Structures are given as C-alpha cells and as structure tokens.
Amino acid sequence: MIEIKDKQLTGLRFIDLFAGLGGFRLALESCGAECVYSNEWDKYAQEVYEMNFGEKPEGDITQVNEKTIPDHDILCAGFPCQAFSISGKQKGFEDSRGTLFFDIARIVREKKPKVVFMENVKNAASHDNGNTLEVVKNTMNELDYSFHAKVLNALDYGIPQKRERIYMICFRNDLNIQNFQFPKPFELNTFVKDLLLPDSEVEHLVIDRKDLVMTNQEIEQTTPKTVRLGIVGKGGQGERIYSTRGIAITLSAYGGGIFAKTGGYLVNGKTRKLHPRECARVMGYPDSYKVHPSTSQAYKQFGNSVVINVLQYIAYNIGSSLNFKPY
DNA sequence: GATAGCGCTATC
DNA sequence: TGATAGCGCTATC
Ligand SMILES: Nc1ncnc2c1ncn2[C@@H]1O[C@H](CSCC[C@H](N)C(=O)O)[C@@H](O)[C@H]1O
Predict the structure, then answer these.
(1) H or E stretch including A124?
(2) Catalytic: A81?
(3) For chain A, which has fewer Cβ within 10 Å, the N-terminal or C-terminal residue?
(4) Domain A1-186+285-327, CATH 3.40.50.150 — does that match?
(5) Phi, psi (5° rounding) for residue A148?
C-alpha cells in the first residue's frame, strides 16, 4: 500500500460492509477517513479483522436494521462475487449469495451517505448481458446517486497482480460532483519476485509433482503480465505455474488445485504456491498486517479481498472531488 | 475445516 | 479460433 501524506478524507466517516480483512478500511484510513462501523459474518474474518482493528464486525448484514448503522459519509462495500464471477456458476441475483447488493441499496436508502464505494469482479460488468450492472446502476440512480463504474487492473496501479475488478463510485446527486475521475494507470515497476519471501521461509510450500510439465522457458526480463511456464495435472485452476518475473494471477477465495487460491510459481528452480504473507503483498497489504492463524482461511480472506493501493488511488480521488468546493 | 480435481466461462 | 485465466464448485476424509 502507498503512503498518503495529503489526507483527502480527514473528518469523513465511513462504513466497512463485507469488511473481510478491512482492505477498504486500510485504504480510506490511509486517506484520513474514519471507520465508524464494520460488518462481516465470517467467524474467521471477524477474527482477523479484530486481530487488526481491535473490533469485531457485526454479523449477517441481511438481518441488521439499516436504521442501526452509524451515520457515515462513505459506504464501502466489496460485496460477494461468487454469483457473478467468470469462475463460478453465474447464477447472479438468483444465487443466495447474490442479492447482497440490494442490502447495500437499502442501507443507502436509510443512511443516505455522501459517497457509495463498491467493488466486485470484472465479469459482473457484463454478467447476464450487462443487466446486472444495469440494475445496480439504475438502483443507484433511483436512490439519487451518480454512478461511476470502471474496471481497473491492479497491474496498472503499482501491484503485480492480474486482478481486474469493477469499481463503482456513487456520489449523492445533491453534492454536485463532476470532476471525479478514476486513477490514471502508470507503469508497473514491481513484479512477483520483488515481493517474494526468502526460500527458507517458503520451503514448506514447495510442491514437487512428477506430472510437472514445463511448457515455457523462464523469462529473463520482467513484464506487466502473467506468464505461464508449466503445469501439473490437467492444468486446471490452481494447477498452472507462472513466472515470478511476470505478474501474479488473481488470488481466489475458494479455489482448488494443488496451488489452491494462489497459483503455482517458479522460484529458484523449485515450483511452489505463494505464502499467505506473499498474498498480502500481492494484495498490497503492509507486512505490519496480521494474517489469520489458519493458512487456508488466510488464503480465502486474501482471495476475495481487494488490492489496497488501487483502493487508495480511488479513495484519494474521491476526496479530491469531495473537497473541491469553490465559491 | 482443509485439501485438491475439476470443468465450464469469457475474451480476443 | 485456440490458448489463457477466473474474490469458483464440491467431493472426500
Ligand atoms: N450476509 C453477510 N453479512 C456479512 N458479511 C457477508 C455476508 N455474506 C457474505 N459476506 C462476506 O462478504 C465478504 C465478500 S469479500 C469482501 C472482502 C473485503 N473488501 C476485503 O478487503 O477483505 C466476505 O468476507 C464474506 O464472508
């Protein structure tokens, strides 16, 4: 994550819905904003969250009275995505875990925050002929909010991860925000191998499988993209080996495969999966952030989390627009 | 809960 | 296409 000297969100209050690890909090907090409420129902996520913010998020958002949520200026929410991801069954809103956005929709109805910040996977952008994104857009307009939506890839914001996500920035129409803009991409100068841990710390992660089949020669030069080198088994999810010289693939929350949730990488001749801490770095989390004691949960948490840095550049720009109030 | 084979999708 | 990749799914122990 990046250091932000000029705090654009000082004095502003924000809610952390579907908090997970607190990625949205890490980001807005770096911009000066203050967290007044967090929500997350996963026992384990609540555990890590506390382990890092000394607070315990509140359970099932679908049973919390909106009127109960603290007043706030910015609603952050990277709601569930299993129901919209390229990787899953795409049952969209029909999916039990897919209606959560309407839970946000009604929080906003009550609290009427100055800004609604949301995040989800790229496929949500076009899911079901783009009708999903459209309901969200109209549902937001009908609450009296503008709807700024764009798909950014982490690799375009200082983080070596091919994580493409759709970010939705909604401003209350009353405030007349017109100069909002999404961060401009900038050259990726960091790669997977720059974030790796020393071999001695990742030995236990090394995987040696007879079905290891290297299909591509390691790359000498760093690149702003994922470069597959080899594969194990049938090369399915979590069975693909990539170049540390390139960028990492998308961390997943439920992903399987021998390299479950992180993907395989080639480090000093050995083939291995990433370490939870490496995921953290891959997600833009500061090493000072405490990962969950359970590697599996830790991986899941980082898997469906967000890249802080990206969240920062957006958050900072959110403040700019918010603060630009000439006479 | 943790591990891991998968199998079908979107994209150009 | 043909090749690549995905905050996933779910069976098993
Ligand atoms: N009804 C509900 N109430 C609270 N949290 C819920 C929920 N349904 C799903 N979730 C939570 O939704 C989160 C979606 S992933 C969001 C991750 C988060 N922005 C981060 O940076 O970690 C998960 O942590 C999941 O456990």
Answers:
(1) helix A123-141
(2) yes
(3) C
(4) yes
(5) -100, 115
